[PDB]
Amino acid sequence: GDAVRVTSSKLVTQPGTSNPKAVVSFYEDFLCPACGIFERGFGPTVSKLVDIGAVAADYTMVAILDSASNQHYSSRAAAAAYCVADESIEAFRRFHAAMFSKDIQPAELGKDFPDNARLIELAREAGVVGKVPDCINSGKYIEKVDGLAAAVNVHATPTVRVNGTEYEWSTPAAMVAKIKEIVGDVPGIDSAAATATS
Q: Which residue range(s) make up the domain with 56? A: 1-198
Q: What contacts 17, CB < 8 A, 6 or more positions away?
A: none
Beta-bridged to residue 28, according to DSSP, are 61
Number of domains the chain contains = 1
The values of phi and psi at residue 107, to 5°, are: -65, 125
Instruction: Please name the method used to determine this structure.
Output: X-ray
CB atoms within 10 A of CB 179: 24
Query: Going by DSSP bridges, is the β-strand pair 165-166/23-28 parallel, antiparallel, or unpaired?
Result: unpaired
Quick one: the chain helix, strand, coil %, rounded to 5?
Answer: 50, 10, 40
CATH number of the CATH domain containing 63: 3.40.30.10
